[PDB]
Amino acid sequence: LRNFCVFSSVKPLDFCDQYSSPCSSDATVDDGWFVCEYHASRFFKMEKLALAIPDGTGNNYYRTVGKSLVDDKAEGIERILIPSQNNYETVLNLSLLGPAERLVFYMIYDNKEKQNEICQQLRMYERFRPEVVEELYNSTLRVLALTNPNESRSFGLSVEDDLAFNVLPTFIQNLIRKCVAPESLTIGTEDLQLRNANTCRITSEGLLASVRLYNSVQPKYLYGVNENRLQIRNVLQFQGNANALQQKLSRYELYQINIPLFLGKQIIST
Amino acid sequence: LRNFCVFSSVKPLDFCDQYSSPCSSDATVDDGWFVCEYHASRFFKMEKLALAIPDGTGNNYYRTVGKSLVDDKAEGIERILIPSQNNYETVLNLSLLGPAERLVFYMIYDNKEKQNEICQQLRMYERFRPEVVEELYNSTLRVLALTNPNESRSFGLSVEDDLAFNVLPTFIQNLIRKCVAPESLTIGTEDLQLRNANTCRITSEGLLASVRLYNSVQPKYLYGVNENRLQIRNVLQFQGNANALQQKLSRYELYQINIPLFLGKQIIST
Amino acid sequence: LRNFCVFSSVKPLDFCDQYSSPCSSDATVDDGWFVCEYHASRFFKMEKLALAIPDGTGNNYYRTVGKSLVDDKAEGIERILIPSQNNYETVLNLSLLGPAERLVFYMIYDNKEKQNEICQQLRMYERFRPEVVEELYNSTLRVLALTNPNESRSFGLSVEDDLAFNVLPTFIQNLIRKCVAPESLTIGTEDLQLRNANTCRITSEGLLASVRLYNSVQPKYLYGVNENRLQIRNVLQFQGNANALQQKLSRYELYQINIPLFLGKQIIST
Amino acid sequence: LRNFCVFSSVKPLDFCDQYSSPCSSDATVDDGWFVCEYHASRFFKMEKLALAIPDGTGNNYYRTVGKSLVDDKAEGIERILIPSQNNYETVLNLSLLGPAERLVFYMIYDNKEKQNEICQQLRMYERFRPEVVEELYNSTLRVLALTNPNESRSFGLSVEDDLAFNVLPTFIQNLIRKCVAPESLTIGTEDLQLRNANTCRITSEGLLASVRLYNSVQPKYLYGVNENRLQIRNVLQFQGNANALQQKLSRYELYQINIPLFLGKQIIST
Lengths: 270, 270, 270, 270
What we know:
Strand order of the largest sheet of chain A: 4-10-5-6
Structural class of chain A: alpha+beta
GO molecular function (chains A, B, C, D): structural molecule activity
Protein name (chains A, B, C, D): Viral capsid 39 protein
Strand content of chain A: 15-25%
Radius of gyration of chain A: 21 Å
Pfam families (chains A, B, C, D): Baculo_VP39
Number of strands of chain A: 10
InterPro entries (chains A, B, C, D): Baculo_VP39
Helix content of chain A: 10-25%
Order of helices and strands of chain A: HEEEHHHHEHHEEEEEHE
Largest sheet of chain A: 4 strands, mixed
Shape of chain A: globular
Number of helices of chain A: 8
Oligomer: part of a larger assembly
Largest interface: A-B, 58 and 60 residues
Organism (chains A, B, C, D): Helicoverpa armigera nucleopolyhedrovirus
């Protein structure tokens, strides 16, 4: 598979002579997400980060991790990173989404009746192109087929988190496992405490950024705004003086205020 | 002051024709530490980091913060970042240190009898140079004089941490205030939760890295080792395969596993 | 009199070889204020404006008027333009002011006992210069002597405003008469309604900017700020787009949002 | 549209080889008036002014506003700034106006029968030019089409003003909204009191300058007079002496006695 993004196969179902997939340049690597960074930020509000674990001889074990794009001002449904099968339609706005994306999301969350209904209502578009729904279905199914089942991953200090994670779909479970780093890894015979407190939670609503940590990250895809019209807000302002703002400290190494997803424990022994 | 490091004035007290201070290139900035990064790493086992707080209009308020160089394997006295006046002699190995560094540390921790004793025993070195102890004393005193007393900083959730921080010397208090970032800043009328859990603690022993977080930082000054002789240890090893170690994820943005000092709350209102 | 400002004679009472009066360039004209624009803005928070009344043949009758520098956010004592004799000490901060300015203000508000006390306590400064208090007293008295009594000016729709204006000192009365323009002038045999509503009020507290009109004027003397330190505020922000902000309308003639002092009626018949 | 004036398309309907539109140089900007300053002064007796609202960071929101050219001596119909659909024919003297201007005004006030009658009586002029009425109709209709429907504008303290404004034509409503500034704007979460009293009123007669404020503005287009013949009037006269007229105050900043249209409240929240 040249492109591993599950949404890569989504194309306009009308008679389009040419189309370019909006997947990012990182969609060609098989990191286990099966979603490109652009689609992860657009739908699940996450970006991709690398986590290097050094053994002590030079080799580094790289593990992918999700960086939350949810701001501290966001509340309620805006804090849901990965919606669960209970309320994914409202979180992802499936009704407003196009039929291809809607069908892909239905297959991802394993809603057989909805997939069948969407297919039987998209039969007519087979007139424009004989592969509007067939090849998309085959590609999405073959991409999802790689997510089915030494690692021992627990996603919480209570059985509630584990049972909430268990009932999630297999693709959602794989995405959560790949995007959520452990609070305290257990590699070989030693424990590596990556962080002392959790950053994301797993409940019936799905994977959320429960803690109100400050996010100082500029999204690389969710950055455009309607510059033409006018908006009113009460922002915080500083003077703009180098001595007052201590701008002379900018030459020092910058500690990025990011929100990587850290939750639970992982055990890697082999 | 061209050099703001308190240890910058330390020179060999013998008849030395020339001497170059070991202070780093960052010793020329007035960040409030009054210790260069080299001396901070050598004595207090900390490096310097910058923390940018954006107001929302473009201007960034930069605050210095200490990055802990203490590894997770370190235990006991090895975890003491800033020794308190109770046990600074044993932590810093003052007896083994040279007379100039010993006198500077005595003045920093405000031990009048020890300063007087060291001065009266260093009178003889005035024969070699008439400024072995005079100009060093004046420079160190004038550097310390900048540390004496809108910000409201609390260094813990209990009164014990506050009372432990209060009894510390004024230079140590200033260094802790500059190097320890708040867990949850309170700027203007809004709270910015930098981190949800503390990373450093303040007790009678001083400022310690109590939590056993994994440190994956390579020191830029405490890196030399005795390559000539032989040492034996049981390190962890990986295979060294790109597919096994997921080296293809190295192109992604790296989440540095650092240990910045976060503790307590800060209030900035003006 | 080359300089008509009442505060022009104020000089440091110590042995000063040279001194330059801080009076503005407009202090040389006799507009009836007897206070320069700089001092009027510094003390009474007013600037000077000209009001041209055309008769109909080309000649223009120019009348001076006060422009209020009080912002809409100011409240209470900050809204007092000209303090009355009841509470001028607290409004003008006479205790903090220098002895020369304090004595000048005491003479302006006609407090005989305070003038005598300040003089008998400034006798000693006659040692440094034999004209520290003598020539200042003579100059201030001769400047005030021009303010003593066809125009018929009423400063309100009720007798309360008139009685409040009557009890004010003669210099304060002259300043109010010169700085406050009439709401509806009555010249010759015709009425000219300059404005339909009042802008300043006269009560026991003095002359105040009672109405919360928006002030969009940049003071030409009260503009300096402490740029070195840091301040926090929640300002309003716009996007900064020409189409959104309608910047293309900047080429049109600008209606300045000023707050000139308009109150009561004036009758000029001769 | 190079020219946004609704009267720009008005041309002599006879066989004219060349014609220059009398629109002012400001007719090329899209300020929402859709009438040039020359035509606004000629018909509606208004000039254009800019009103800058500063947010507090440097950006200025510019809003157009109408300056009344009605003198205080004007009475009755002479005080009608924008005639309503009830009596626009008598105010604008439609019968005396040319057929092109009459048809344009009929389309502006939405009088379908009159537009049809004027068109069927201007068919004959199609002999001279085949676009005497066609292109004029298309241009005027396309200009009017931009006036059809976060801002919340109230044009009075009583329901009578609102209902009088509602029944007005859409072009007249847009012109009134653009030309009449609010007495007290409400931007973001704060109120900016531009003026404490209204200056223009809206009744069944239309938009009038009800208050008899003195107008000291020299029109830039309604300035020509019949110099050849003789006229008699009893004007007011002054002496012409610098000391008597206080001409020395002319160097001060001049407070222009204008009559901008201020009425009602506006709410801008987004």
